[PDB]
Amino acid sequence: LYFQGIDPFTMSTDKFEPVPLPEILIFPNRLLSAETTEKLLNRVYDVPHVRQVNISGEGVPAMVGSGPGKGLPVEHEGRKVINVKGREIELQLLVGRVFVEIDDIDVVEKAIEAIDEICQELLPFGYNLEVGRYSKYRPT
Amino acid sequence: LLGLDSTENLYFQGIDPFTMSTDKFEPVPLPEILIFPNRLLSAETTEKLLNRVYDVPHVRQVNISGEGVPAMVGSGPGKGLPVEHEGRKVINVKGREIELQLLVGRVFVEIDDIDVVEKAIEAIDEICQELLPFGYNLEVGRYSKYRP
């Protein structure tokens, strides 16, 4: 079937305006240490067409299921400082998500292959990569 | 040879190119509505927002991202002083007690079907108008898994 409608992810509608820049999303199978985060961000910023890299800790801590502290959250991690392309970044939490903004939809495929090669080396415990494409709600 | 170029710009109009590489990318059926508050949310506002969002029809799951907060703080010669509850806050969402450890900057609301997103985003917009007076932006996201 040859589509004849309008997709709000790729064209303006009366309710949506496409966000030009996609994300490459990294979902590691284990949280990232400060050191891993530092190496990952430095390497990813060297990939052509990467505009910015953002990170997040988890919203909800890990709960202790056995031993001392059972039933309670793990002890909160300590603050760490990393150096990304000469800028100091303070980490309050182990990193569970990475968001990589790419400067053009057309180069996503190449960018994600490059990022995949980095992750193969740095995230031996496994990970998943996704492309996110967005549209802004702008009614009327 | 203007005039005799190939016509992929017409044939593929409105399609994102990477999506045609089905050897490498698998479409994710379920979209998300994203809430981007203009300020990082307090635990109190996060709690209110999550309670209301979980009542919107067709919401499947809700995730959050944002900025961590220290569990130790100090301005003296010694080590940091520990913050009560390790700096985290307990919130109550639909009867569940949840330890929150982010100032929230992005809410990810998974919707069960692209076809119901319009009505869902209208309900979420009404919530945000009420709960986020400092302003916010809403977006929809569609995902593709890289599976080379």
Author numbering:
A (entry chain B): -9 to 130
B (entry chain A): -18 to 129
Could you pull the original sentences from the published paper?
We present here the high‐resolution crystal structure for McrD from a human gut methanogen Methanomassiliicoccus luminyensis strain B10. The structure reveals that McrD comprises a ferredoxin‐like domain assembled into an α + β barrel‐like dimer with conformational flexibility exhibited by a functional loop.
Methyl‐coenzyme M reductase (MCR) is a multi‐subunit (α2β2γ2) enzyme responsible for methane formation via its unique F430 cofactor. The genes responsible for producing MCR (mcrA, mcrB and mcrG) are typically colocated with two other highly conserved genes mcrC and mcrD. The description of the M. luminyensis McrD crystal structure contributes to our understanding of this key conserved methanogen protein typically responsible for promoting MCR activity and the production of methane, a greenhouse gas.
